[PDB]
Assembly symmetry: C4
Homo-oligomer: 479 residues x 4
Amino acid sequence: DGREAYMSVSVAMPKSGEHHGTADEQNVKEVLLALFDASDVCLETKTLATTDYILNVGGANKAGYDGKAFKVPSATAKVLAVVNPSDKFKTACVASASWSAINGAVEQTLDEVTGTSKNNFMMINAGDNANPTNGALVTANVKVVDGTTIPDVATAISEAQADRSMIYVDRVVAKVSLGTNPDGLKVPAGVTCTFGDWALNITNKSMFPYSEIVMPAGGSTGADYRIDPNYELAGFDVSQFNYLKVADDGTLPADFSAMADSKYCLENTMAADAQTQAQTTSAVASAVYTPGSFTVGESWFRLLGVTYKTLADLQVVYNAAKAAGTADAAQTQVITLCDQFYARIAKAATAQGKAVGADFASITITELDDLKSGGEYSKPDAAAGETVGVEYFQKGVCYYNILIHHDDAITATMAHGKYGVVRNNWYTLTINSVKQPGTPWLPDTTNPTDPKDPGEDDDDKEAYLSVEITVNPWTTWSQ
Amino acid sequence: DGREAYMSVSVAMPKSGEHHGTADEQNVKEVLLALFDASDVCLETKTLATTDYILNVGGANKAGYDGKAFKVPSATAKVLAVVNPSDKFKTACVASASWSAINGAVEQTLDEVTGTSKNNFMMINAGDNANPTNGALVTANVKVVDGTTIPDVATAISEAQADRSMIYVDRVVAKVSLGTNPDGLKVPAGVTCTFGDWALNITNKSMFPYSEIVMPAGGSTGADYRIDPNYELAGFDVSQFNYLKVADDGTLPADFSAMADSKYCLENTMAADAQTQAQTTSAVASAVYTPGSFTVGESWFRLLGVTYKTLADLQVVYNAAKAAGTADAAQTQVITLCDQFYARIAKAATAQGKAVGADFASITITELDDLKSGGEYSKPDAAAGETVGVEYFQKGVCYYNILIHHDDAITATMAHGKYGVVRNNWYTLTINSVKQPGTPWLPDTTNPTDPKDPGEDDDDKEAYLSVEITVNPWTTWSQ
Amino acid sequence: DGREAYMSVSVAMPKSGEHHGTADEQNVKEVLLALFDASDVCLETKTLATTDYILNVGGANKAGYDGKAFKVPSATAKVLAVVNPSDKFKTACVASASWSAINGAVEQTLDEVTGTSKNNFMMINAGDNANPTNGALVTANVKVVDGTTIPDVATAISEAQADRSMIYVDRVVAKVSLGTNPDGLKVPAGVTCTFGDWALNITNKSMFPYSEIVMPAGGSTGADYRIDPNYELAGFDVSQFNYLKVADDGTLPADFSAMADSKYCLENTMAADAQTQAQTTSAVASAVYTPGSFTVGESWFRLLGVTYKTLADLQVVYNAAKAAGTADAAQTQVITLCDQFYARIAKAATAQGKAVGADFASITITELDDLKSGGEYSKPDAAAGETVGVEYFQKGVCYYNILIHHDDAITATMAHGKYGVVRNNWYTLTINSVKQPGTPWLPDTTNPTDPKDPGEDDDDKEAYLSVEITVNPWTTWSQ
Amino acid sequence: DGREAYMSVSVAMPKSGEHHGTADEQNVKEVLLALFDASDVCLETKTLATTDYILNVGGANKAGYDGKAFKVPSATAKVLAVVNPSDKFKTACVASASWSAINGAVEQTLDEVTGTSKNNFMMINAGDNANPTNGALVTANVKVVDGTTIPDVATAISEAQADRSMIYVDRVVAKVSLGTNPDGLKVPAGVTCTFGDWALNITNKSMFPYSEIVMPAGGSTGADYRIDPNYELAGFDVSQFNYLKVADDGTLPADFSAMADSKYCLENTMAADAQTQAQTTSAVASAVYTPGSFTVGESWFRLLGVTYKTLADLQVVYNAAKAAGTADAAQTQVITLCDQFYARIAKAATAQGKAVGADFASITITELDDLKSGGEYSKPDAAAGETVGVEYFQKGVCYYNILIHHDDAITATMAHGKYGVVRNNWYTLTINSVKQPGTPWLPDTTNPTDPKDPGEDDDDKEAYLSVEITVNPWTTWSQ
Ligand SMILES: [Ca+2]
Ligand SMILES: [Ca+2]
Ligand SMILES: [Ca+2]
Ligand SMILES: [Ca+2]
Ligand SMILES: [Cl-]
Ligand SMILES: [Cl-]
Ligand SMILES: [Cl-]
Ligand SMILES: [Cl-]
Ligand SMILES: [Cl-]
Ligand SMILES: [Cl-]
Ligand SMILES: [Cl-]
Ligand SMILES: [Cl-]
Ligand SMILES: [Cl-]
Ligand SMILES: [Cl-]
Ligand SMILES: [Cl-]
Ligand SMILES: [Cl-]
Ligand SMILES: [Cl-]
Ligand SMILES: [Cl-]
Ligand SMILES: [Cl-]
Ligand SMILES: [Cl-]
């Protein structure tokens, strides 16, 4: 300590052609540097000016980032660079704190690590793929003025600038894209099915600034996995993830936007047995599904394996069942399920300040179609022990749930690394075929009677679409 | 009303690789913002400065478009953005007008919505593909200073800037490209056929600022159709469209230009039974067609299924028919049709102040070839009840009519969405083969005796070329 | 005349992906505008400033080229734009001269129409492909202040700017590229053959500023041909073309450069019967050819179908022939041809101030290899009636002659448009295979005893290489 | 001498699409020009300002490089341009020195010819591929003021600028890239193998500023070879090359970095019989190799063809061998080799200040895994006559040695030009398959008992990987 010591740094962003990010995904607003002693204790933090570092983007040094040497404590052994640090990270990462303390798990909103304008992506030391035990911190090439080896500060500065500490950084979030096959979508005979707005579901609420690298068996080079804060199966709780929900007034979550938009999420990984549907990040795709002979955009129904073109056609079956002198098992089940549908529709009508008929036989399609997210209310109430009955595809709208796969070389049932979203990976989802209608309601893989129920295994999920998922490193480009 | 209220906006231009438009096709001269209350009544309009919005082009925020929050009426619920508004739109879109009134059908010239220099393309709210009933207007994220939730104007400004209203915009016109197969053109044995200048025909005179989205049966994702002001078959009138016409002096319309040029048009859609040849936007391609053994560029003729290398060869047949003691059916028909040709040629000669022989037997190729657009005058006069007779391919020039198809997944006869030109779509026409000569005259699918005759069905059109038509979204690129 | 008249212009450079030229090939140093009356008589010429025109490059208007209207004579009917005019063109193109006079054939060096730094390419009105009779001149949209239709100069200016005269321009030269197959070159068994510097041969000395378009029979769309000043067979003279020649001191022409370089030439077209080897522009490719078992780069010889590894091996055959008591036909022919070789080698030695042995039996490889372009002197002296004898492949160097083909759809023997180099076309030559050694000397298809001998027919040329020739329009790109 | 003489120059960087270098690989910090008389004696050197030359990058002249003529000695005949000259070159290349003296072989570190920031690449005259005897120097187009041909200095300046001396330059180093097959890596059944950091090995310590071009038999066009300072087999010494070595404390050389990084090296060529493993530049690839059923990242062992999951499993075999009453050949060999392993491990423990058990039976995996580069110490001590015994794959880490091939058209055993790294070539190495584990230690093809032992023939090397090596010219791009 007390000695004159200098170092220089180069911050290098991910590099490889087709998977370069946008200008906003590589925008730099702030660079924080944390200097650690040999015991991984932070000695000092520094907010870097453009003169203080080399910025290598898309494999090239950016003009205006000078890489001039700067003074550091002589005990500096290791370095951490954080591009666009969140406010929680800036508060945790201070002098006298240890790297273990600074790297504690934290809750973060997506905006806190990407910016509300999606031009402020937090990035941190990438770590070594074939050396996971090494961790995040990079060796600091400190030139200590000792009068012998390094005689003056001018020599320390020239030596530091000729021996920069190269720090590769990774964005802390994953990127996801959704699209349909450009050559056309395969659909059942006579069906029309067009896709609309989408959203990510089951996104992580929390992360480690730097998660530990784990290499799964049968894993691909560059498909490194990570240990996030909700990794083991036993610790599961719905409070750990963000779930898509329709508002009380029937308003869809603001998360839905055009398929032309890419979406981001905190990383979300799992142990092999934790690859369960209530804790796996998924893409929710909305569509308008039109069975053959039906008019596109017109509401249609399904009950007990029977499709009904109109509410009136379904009411014919209900009225016949109610007109029975002594109702049999099939007739009783029709009345039960239409009445369960009616009470949920009546509840939604009240919550939206809208009028509906007095019972299932008296409701009209005009009253139903006027309810915002009307199809959501055909979802059975699992807390009442209800199971799927009436499905109301309001204006033909339905939703699909797509589990996001991670390493495409891993195909075995519930194998480690098969599912997940890892930082700085760009997941591309291409819908190739539609096998059947989705659900009228937003997918819900959780248990309303148990917040610790992790849901069904990911490989038990019923197939509704044929989706091709590719994973690529999310790189940067030089102007 | 009267309360301090702020909002921020982001104007996003179409985005996806190969179908990016030019710099001029994304140039911004003006941005008008219309603010609506919950009843869709315009409260205020604002001409935005570069400081007042985010401009997202080719998926990235453009430098210089700051996105700073601006003051708005507290009753603001919805927003409309118009890039490069036409003068009629700027006059219609004023405070106190309703959205239904502002969105009334209007006549527009192509220059009024693209600019005379084709660098001033009008763009408006794109609307939702899987939610057509929702319309154009986007929810405004208004931050109202209420002292409670939002304490001061600085908070309203920071909250508005952290929650921008994202408005996707679409250009109001379609883009069309014409070319030949790069690997070569298939032609009949010994034929030479080279293509020259082209033009769009039957372009709409009118449009809705925002036309209603309709989703056809069997339609593709992203191939959304629209309802324009001349959609139903019964309303057809030739006064509704722009048609290519040769001037009185034989001058070709200025609309013709090199195949290297792309062309634009107002959108023009139809009901399934309105897909008729007098109301479908088409590409008119000019060519020089040379039958085998003939000299390229030399005038040639056709009459009653017989091709004649020279006018003199045709005059031999005419003179033999006139020399008959008693002319039979075939001979009489030859005289009738050559005499009908002569009178139209003599009329054109007078209109151009040019000399021709006294009758069909006395005219020469020198006199005919000196007439501007000479081939146009071999067109029969349908008002006189004339039908095709002599075809004069002046210097081998002929024209082809190409109906522009919309959704390539729709192939059934006269199926909804098979034909049309929709806003913000780039139609690429590739000529692969020539089957026979085109017409000596500009294509004319109208009835001169009836302005309400919609012409033959689009799927009844005789095939002269083999053309591949692809449709792609017309996107933008970031520098 | 005397009336206030205004016009505006747009100069558009060639446009289409892979065949975009370089920044230097589209650089603008000067723009001359010639204004013509209805009789094609030049009324005025104007050197345009950046404010006076729109410059459309790679399909987009370039920033800084304002397109502001400018005053012109009221009798202006037509317009010619010349980008980077040569000094001869600037002298010919003056007020009171007719377009026929200005467009007279002229001699031009390549530097006079491309610039000595190859950043000053002359460009002129492109003309209509399907209307060759129309010529170069484009209709001028002149807005004449008549107080009635056009009331004031401000209106004339606004109307001119809203109705610009669009002038497409073409570079007056052709571009040629030479390369080998990237996947490898097919060569005879055990042969090594590597290609080096190349040059264009038989380049035109003269041109028309605007040559007449001609459309050949069987021609492709966009493969338009032209009539240059040395088109008919009867007019041929070697004085009309530039030919590659070795200097008196053995120095190679400066025209030779690396295959990485593209080359340019004035256009050079021919009538079908004028496609002869002394008047067809060709690419001359140099190579080092090594027969199997020979050392690469070592001199080797050929005489009367026999290859000799060394001069000494050939001298063995000569000495055996001279030692014969009575020499037979074969022995006499060996002595004749080696003695003819010796006298040309001795002449070259004298011209270079170098020493050689007294006769063929006394020369050594050291003396021969010290002669600059030594292989050139194995060329027979046709003025003495000599025919091919000794071939001296000095350091294995040989040359190939590649006739440049124009329309790849034209394959018939000596068919019109099969050979030639047309303005604004980019010819790509890809060598795929080597069939045999080239010549030790620069190719020479001329007759030294007759400057009017047009040489053999192009389709009579013996095949030494397999070369793929593609022709593409040479386009421009926008930044 | 004493006369006014002027010249102008153009410095042209390598040009062709996919093999363009980065902006840093074409950055210009300094340009030295050396002017030579007809005897190849340097008359003067000049440090050029941006006004003094044309800079052609990616085939286009860069803005700001004016190419204005400059004064030179009248005896100037030839010119050498050096972009970013090393300090040794700037000291050697002075007036009065001959080109043979300046072009003497020298030792250079990679930083001295690329810059410590890898943005200062030394470049020099490229030379002629089909004329190797010609050498580096380019003819200088000197315009000497003689009052006759050249009357004044203004004429000398204009003539020099109209006749620039074009100098093509090549970077003096090679570029190397390493990656895995994007479609996936083929591995043995049940094996996991992921690649990590890599480095170049056996890089040249020395070079000629301009090495002589040699053209191998069967060589490809553009695949020119060179004669470097350690070319003949007889001259081999390990002192001539840089070799990768683990530090005394077990630290890996700093040369190792991510596969995303490209690496550079001085050129290193060989005579056909000098293509030996101790003098051929190679890529060393690190990996984590996991045999089937083993846990990824856990240490594993191999001895006498037997793989052991744990140290304890191997100690079972050792203890059984030591417990034998009379040890046989197999048992004795096990004890010998484990004891040889133990003594090297104990030596490494001492050098790192770490504790280990007293003998092979007493060591634990915890003690071994705590040693830095632990696997390095399973390398047999060849100076003690040791051969491969215990292989300790510490945390599964192993290394592969990839000999870099030069001309892919050369495949014959030990054929000239098959191996090597030549200046201004970009070598791409793609790993397609893993056949077996690499070595626990850094590859070492040298003999510790003989610094003149050139190692085994390159074509005798045992195959561990299937690697595809492509070679391309390393070009430049224009903005
Ligand atoms: Ca998790
Ligand atoms: Ca219509
Ligand atoms: Ca010619
Ligand atoms: Ca060597
Ligand atoms: Cl923690
Ligand atoms: Cl935003
Ligand atoms: Cl709510
Ligand atoms: Cl997002
Ligand atoms: Cl209306
Ligand atoms: Cl314009
Ligand atoms: Cl008219
Ligand atoms: Cl247009
Ligand atoms: Cl002339
Ligand atoms: Cl130059
Ligand atoms: Cl000479
Ligand atoms: Cl050239
Ligand atoms: Cl030396
Ligand atoms: Cl650096
Ligand atoms: Cl050491
Ligand atoms: Cl390196």
